[PDB]
Amino acid sequence: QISVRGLAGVENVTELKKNFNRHLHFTLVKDRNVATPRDYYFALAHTVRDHLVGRWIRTQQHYYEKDPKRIYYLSLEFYMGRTLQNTMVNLALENACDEATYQLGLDMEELEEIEEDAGLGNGGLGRLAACFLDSMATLGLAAYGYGIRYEFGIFNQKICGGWQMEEADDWLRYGNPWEKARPEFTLPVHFYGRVEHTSQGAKWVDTQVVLAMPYDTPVPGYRNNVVNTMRLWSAKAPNDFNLGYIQAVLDRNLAENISRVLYPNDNFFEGKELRLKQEYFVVAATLQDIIRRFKSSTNFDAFPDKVAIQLNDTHPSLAIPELMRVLVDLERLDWDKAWEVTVKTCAYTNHTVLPEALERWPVHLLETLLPRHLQIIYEINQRFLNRVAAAFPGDVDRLRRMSLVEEGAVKRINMAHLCIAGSHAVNGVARIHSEILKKTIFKDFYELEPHKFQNKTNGITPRRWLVLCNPGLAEIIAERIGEEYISDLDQLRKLLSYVDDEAFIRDVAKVKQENKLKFAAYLEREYKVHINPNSLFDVQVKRIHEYKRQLLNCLHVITLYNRIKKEPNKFVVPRTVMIGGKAAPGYHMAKMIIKLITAIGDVVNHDPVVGDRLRVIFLENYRVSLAEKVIPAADLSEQISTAGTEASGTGNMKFMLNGALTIGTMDGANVEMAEEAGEENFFIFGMRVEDVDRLDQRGYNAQEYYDRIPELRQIIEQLSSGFFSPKQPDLFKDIVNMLMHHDRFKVFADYEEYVKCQERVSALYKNPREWTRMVIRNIATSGKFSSDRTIAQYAREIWGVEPSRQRLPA
Amino acid sequence: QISVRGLAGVENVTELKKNFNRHLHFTLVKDRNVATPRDYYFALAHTVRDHLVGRWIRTQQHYYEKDPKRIYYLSLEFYMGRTLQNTMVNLALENACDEATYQLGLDMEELEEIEEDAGLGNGGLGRLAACFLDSMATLGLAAYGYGIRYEFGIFNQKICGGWQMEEADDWLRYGNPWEKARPEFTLPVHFYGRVEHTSQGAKWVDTQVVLAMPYDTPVPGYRNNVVNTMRLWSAKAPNDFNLGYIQAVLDRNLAENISRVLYPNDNFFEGKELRLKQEYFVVAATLQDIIRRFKSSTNFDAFPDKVAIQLNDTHPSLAIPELMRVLVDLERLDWDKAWEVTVKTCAYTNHTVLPEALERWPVHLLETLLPRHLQIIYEINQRFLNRVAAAFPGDVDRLRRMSLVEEGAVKRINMAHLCIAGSHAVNGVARIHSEILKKTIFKDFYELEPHKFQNKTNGITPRRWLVLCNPGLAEIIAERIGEEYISDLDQLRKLLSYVDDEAFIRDVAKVKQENKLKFAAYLEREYKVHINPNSLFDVQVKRIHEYKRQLLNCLHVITLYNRIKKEPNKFVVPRTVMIGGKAAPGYHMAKMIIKLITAIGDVVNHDPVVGDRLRVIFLENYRVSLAEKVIPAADLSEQISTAGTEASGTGNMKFMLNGALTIGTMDGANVEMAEEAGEENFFIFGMRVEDVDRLDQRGYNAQEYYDRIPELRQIIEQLSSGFFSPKQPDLFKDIVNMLMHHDRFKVFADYEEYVKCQERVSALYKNPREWTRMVIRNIATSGKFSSDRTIAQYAREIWGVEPSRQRLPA
Numbered sequence A, B: 001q002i003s004v005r006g007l008a009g010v011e012n013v014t015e016l017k018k019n020f021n022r023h024l025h026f027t028l029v030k031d032r033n034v035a036t037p038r039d040y041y042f043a044l045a046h047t048v049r050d051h052l053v054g055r056w057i058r059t060q061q062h063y064y065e066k067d068p069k070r071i072y073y074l075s076l077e078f079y080m081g082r083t084l085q086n087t088m089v090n091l092a093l094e095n096a097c098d099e100a101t102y103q104l105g106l107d108m109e110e111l112e113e114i115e116e117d118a119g120l121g122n123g124g125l126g127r128l129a130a131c132f133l134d135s136m137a138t139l140g141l142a143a144y145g146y147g148i149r150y151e152f153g154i155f156n157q158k159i160c161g162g163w164q165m166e167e168a169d170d171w172l173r174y175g176n177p178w179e180k181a182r183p184e185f186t187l188p189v190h191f192y193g194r195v196e197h198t199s200q201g202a203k204w205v206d207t208q209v210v211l212a213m214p215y216d217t218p219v220p221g222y223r224n225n226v227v228n229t230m231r232l233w234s235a236k237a238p239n240d241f242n243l244g245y246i247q248a249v250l251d252r253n254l255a256e257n258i259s260r261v262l263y264p265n266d267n268f269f270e271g272k273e274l275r276l277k278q279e280y281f282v283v284a285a286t287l288q289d290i291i292r293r294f295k296s297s298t299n300f301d302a303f304p305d306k307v308a309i310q311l312n313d314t315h316p317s318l319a320i321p322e323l324m325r326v327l328v329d330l331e332r333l334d335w336d337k338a339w340e341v342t343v344k345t346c347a348y349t350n351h352t353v354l355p356e357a358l359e360r361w362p363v364h365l366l367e368t369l370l371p372r373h374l375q376i377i378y379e380i381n382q383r384f385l386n387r388v389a390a391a392f393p394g395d396v397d398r399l400r401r402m403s404l405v406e407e408g409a410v411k412r413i414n415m416a417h418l419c420i421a422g423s424h425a426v427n428g429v430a431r432i433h434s435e436i437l438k439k440t441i442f443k444d445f446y447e448l449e450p451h452k453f454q455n456k457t458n459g460i461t462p463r464r465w466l467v468l469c470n471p472g473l474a475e476i477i478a479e480r481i482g483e484e485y486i487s488d489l490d491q492l493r494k495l496l497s498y499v500d501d502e503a504f505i506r507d508v509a510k511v512k513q514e515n516k517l518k519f520a521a522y523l524e525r526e527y528k529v530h531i532n533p534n535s536l537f538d539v540q541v542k543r544i545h546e547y548k549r550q551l552l553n554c555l556h557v558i559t560l561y562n563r564i565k566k567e568p569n570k571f572v573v574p575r576t577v578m579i580g581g582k583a584a585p586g587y588h589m590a591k592m593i594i595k596l597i598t599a600i601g602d603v604v605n606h607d608p609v610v611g612d613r614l615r616v617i618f619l620e621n622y623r624v625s626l627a628e629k630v631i632p633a634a635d636l637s638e639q640i641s642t643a644g645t646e647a648s649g650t651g652n653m654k655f656m657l658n659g660a661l662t663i664g665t666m667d668g669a670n671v672e673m674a675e676e677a678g679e680e681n682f683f684i685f686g687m688r689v690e691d692v693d694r695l696d697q698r699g700y701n702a703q704e705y706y707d708r709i710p711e712l713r714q715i716i717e718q719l720s721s722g723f724f725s726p727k728q729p730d731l732f733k734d735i736v737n738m739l740m741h742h743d744r745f746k747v748f749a750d751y752e753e754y755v756k757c758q759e760r761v762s763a764l765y766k767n768p769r770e771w772t773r774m775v776i777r778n779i780a781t782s783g784k785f786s787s788d789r790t791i792a793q794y795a796r797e798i799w800g801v802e803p804s805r806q807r808l809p810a
């Protein structure tokens, strides 16, 4: 049908049909009389997987023979989403499978919808890990992702009575055809116990053992025949575990609970023992696998020449003291040599400055669970502080601020300080964030070791986030500039030559229109909701958090409602305002925000005076597969965090690639996006970081804004008095109280500029030709935000390896 | 190589090789460079499984079109053992796979040893269920086995310091290539709740739900292209289960524990709640599946024409009140009609008369767990007793003895009484056992409903228990009488014509000798134990229980030792005495018996005066795959239970088929075996049932035997004084105490006859030609003990269906 989806050759189609029927009969044990759509999905998935196998085996043999430096990306989250379509895209099989299935009487798009998301992450951090794997494979790097195979991923969100309810995400119920269990590379992981000091060093004894069993998933590069591996560990009890009899077998559950469920926090730390066990489990199993692979090529001088370990935040920070433990206690290296190897091997990426998100583990927990690691941490700390004291003699307060050990009520280990001390490179995730790290929270570290600190601005994969989710747009671009841009996104700059081309303008606007119709139809089918597809699609999708300021969007929505009610017969640009995202289960204020959004919808959507001029829709169960549907359909991307809080953002980038304009603050990567497109082509508003600092010095007084802005005061009075909750008039009083007295994120301070800037959006939308020209200028300058660019920078500036676009043979 | 293993045609071998390599690459994702023997095993298993699929699909379609009466065999145990070799035997693929693997550089016998037993049973009852499935398929019956997929089967036994230690049998760790998950036929099962009585009947409300997910395993018939199904249910929590958040997900374990582990008792009942949940789980899920299949062909008049349910002991007895519940509460049949359907549909097999093995559930447990089932049971009881009272007016004591409800301290439901009341047929498992049921424990029931009571003597499958485990014997038989006997075992009578044929005598004795050499070598390899393969192999393998009298065998062994020590220079026929079997983990006396056996070995095996004249070996981890090795190698089969206690036995039959002579009491099926072979060809000794009764009336006084038999007294003094436990002299005093004061099984009363009869065994073994002639007379008359005979009788006399030897097309 369309060119970027590849060739449907007669031979290839005939073979795909034959293999589909083979898997239906032999693998699934069904005939066509009794097969359901789910059986058809599995038959297709097995058929496509068969095409990965030879390449997977060949890629791994190639790494064994060439022995390149290997890159190990360690993360507690990999937010993969669905695999079927992505695999077909990367192997150039999409049109062939469409034709084969069409010839068998089946619709491939309906089969794709059956697959479960692999939801092994919370949001941006986990999704970044997934983009990165895709880019590493596309760039020919010998890379492995290592994590945990959670039995239950991020919860499924249902909305009941306008409230979030959580359901378990039993993603493995029907089987996962993409993974291969590897019970033969099972490894032991130790917990608890005590330390004995012999004449021949320290020994960690009397430990409890849990087994780590690996499951491997293929990660195909884009049309280069490289298939890398994601290795996820699952927890198993040993067979002599607890070994009256029946209870001992049932208690195997205690050990296997380590890999049971993903902690559903985003930007929020809690010191729970189970989470610490998860973190050590992944590190201990991973490092053993790494060492085994290194020895099969005790000269550890060469270890950093053959191995890089990238820490995705502090969540796998125990890799530092575990590497030391192995080298000192088991391999018998002297401390100083071990430390040299460790620092040269490890690098740390920081993803947040919010203080409540930073991991600070109580010492008593580490003492019980990981007594040897605590000894090693103290020794790292004493040696590190000895260096600080030599460089800044007499600066006793600096010694307290830089310590890995925080004093107090409960002594804690600051894991971020541990990661900086033990890594040769430390990076933030957007230019403004990296600068903030050097000026504020890690200023002391930067002064001691300035060479360590870098920036690596985030990116997204253009395979999933353009070709897969928006083939119509990919196609109209390819018609003009060819297909090379899919793996070299900077080539999108060539589209600036088409900003005045009437045909290109028309085709861009047509693609958006088709995507909006398709999305409006999806909403009627699966959720019984009617929307005007000629309205401006105003979209804010991301996790629910005070810092992301869904509440600021709420206040705009109410403003627009109130203005319609005041002058009902005046024209206004119609909007469909869509907000979606999950709240962490124990985060009360986030749950109240969801309820506010649905309550505003209840009033607005049923007011006959409003008509179809304004609709407010809460999009339930926001996840990767839903992002692939709504992002292509958006007109306006809402990126409105308080300046200084969103370390990067990556949703922002996905919207820019797919032909939405952005309204946003100068925060995170929004800064760089505006720089690349031109500020004239972005809707920028609100306090800059320096303005937030100035208000903090004077003291933020929300009352002042209430007193001076009548439109704002009317909204607060409506919230307080029960206008949006007529049966429970005090329902929203905690939201009102927070906004008026303890708002850390200064929602009222950006309200006036936000409303004014939204009026400019509406004005431009009235002129479709000019809106579309601005869109072209955004898509054309989105190339910097390819994760291929990001990964090339990590490779050259941190890992010491050279990317390659060279194909392996098929 | 050998004829009964089938043809190795060039085409077939070429195809098997190609498919093996295909599964190695695509299914296992390995190349030959990195493949282990376990990978080779899986590649073969997938290759053989592919040959089952078409036949499986075709068989199930055939049943759908013909709509025969369906037979549902309900069991809490299916002791399947390994599947690979059995599948090849039943599809005639054994020589072809041997040749294919040989051509690939692999030894198929080494690959077979990798497979785990499916150990989903305790011993004889579970193994009988497995034999039965094999026979039902071979006889063309539309039969389904239904049970539970335990995550952990019967424990692995290790012997440490001579004591039994238990390890979890994590049989699924590497995957089970034989099963197919069917998550689409998942069904709900209800627990707890309460009953409401409306105007429109009783309603069972406020229940907790557990899901039952089925896994299907193929059961191939012998060369008839029929493949039936074994459907095993696995427990899953619903997704809203308990739905702070993290704990709710971890607590899904509570529901999933239902299918976690097999209770490891043999002939011993304990009233644990988890076991009751297992029993209801299997019944509730099964009956829904049965009803669904019946409706897809509300006229329940025809239900017993299309359905038979066979209850394997009382373990699935809740099927009776559950069928009633469905018909009355959900389908709205009147009680009397429902009851007619139930009784005509259900039939009950009893497997034991020991009072401690009979299920008697406390009422308070049923009241909490299954309140509606308890109401239905009481109503069954009241109606049943109304009939008793009409037939035997004034016989108030009969009403108390026959009640389903036992009065007392704790009121209990007698499940056996429930099964008799609600079934149209009740059978025992050997002629003597069936007679005992009519004269003793169910006498009252027999007087009320004599037509219900039948016998169905047990049997074993000759596919597993001759062709598979002893191909050399199968072959020498086939050379004389052809191959038809494999599915018509009565044809073994033709071998009586060869009792004087010198060539046949030689070949029979040669096969035994080869099997003994192979077994002696297995023992040196895997267990570092040396044995004389010219010695008489004296074997007692079965679960450890007082009633089975492993202790009587111990006393003989000590007697032989003591006689050697007394006259060291006299000739005695050398023996290797092998005892094996598992003890239930909480059965203290069974555990002490194992320790006694190993302690006797410690002394005997290291006494230089004994030499290789006597060796005592405890065979560790006795299970189906070990039975297949040791049974072909045995000379003497020890079947020495106290008369009246072993309902049938089935090990006895396996030994008779494989060319061992039997020493045994007139108990269980030993009676019928002696009748078929002739008493002159069996080593019968000891009290008959009537003799045991006479001693019970007078009172058993063990002291009398101690006082009169000097050889017995010497042994008791050696046990008491520490001769076999020099470091812990009192170690065995509980065994001594039991034998002297509270032996329910009268070990001393059969001692003198047992020793005398053992001397006759030794005398015959000295004359190999006459020993072998007697063996021929046993093998030749073993045909009655085919489970094909047993199943044909169930089919005609209970189920109302006609077996068929007709082949389906391939």
Ligand SMILES: OC[C@H]1O[C@@H](c2nnc(-c3ccc4c(c3)Cc3ccccc3-4)[nH]2)[C@H](O)[C@@H](O)[C@@H]1O
Binding pocket: A122, A124, A125, A128, A263, A264, A265, A266, A267, A268, A269, A270, A275, A351, A352, A357, A429, A458, A646, A647, A648, A649, A650, A668
């Ligand atoms: O660079 C990728 C993205 O990382 C996000 C992030 N920054 N920190 C986290 C974070 C995620 C999960 C969890 C924590 C922090 C703490 C925690 C504790 C327990 C379980 C999960 C989590 N996520 C940033 O907010 C976002 O601006 C950035 O684009």
Ligand SMILES: OC[C@H]1O[C@@H](c2nnc(-c3ccc4c(c3)Cc3ccccc3-4)[nH]2)[C@H](O)[C@@H](O)[C@@H]1O
Binding pocket: B122, B124, B125, B128, B263, B264, B265, B266, B267, B268, B269, B270, B275, B351, B352, B357, B429, B458, B646, B647, B648, B649, B650, B668
């Ligand atoms: O007909 C097949 C065989 O059934 C055996 C049996 N008779 N009762 C049981 C039995 C097995 C398991 C369990 C129970 C009884 C009670 C129990 C409770 C809990 C768990 C398992 C078990 N087993 C008989 O002892 C044997 O003579 C016969 O050949």
Ligand SMILES: *Cc1c(COP(=O)(O)O)cnc(C)c1O
Binding pocket: A122, A123, A124, A127, A541, A542, A543, A622, A623, A624, A627, A648, A649, A650, A651, A652, A654
């Ligand atoms: C990209 C993405 C995110 C991150 O969005 P932000 O707006 O950067 O927070 C979160 N969740 C999903 C499912 C995503 O695809």
Ligand SMILES: *Cc1c(COP(=O)(O)O)cnc(C)c1O
Binding pocket: B122, B123, B124, B127, B541, B542, B543, B622, B623, B624, B627, B648, B649, B650, B651, B652, B654
């Ligand atoms: C046949 C068999 C049994 C039953 O043996 P009995 O001597 O009848 O108790 C028990 N366990 C295994 C493994 C068997 O194969």
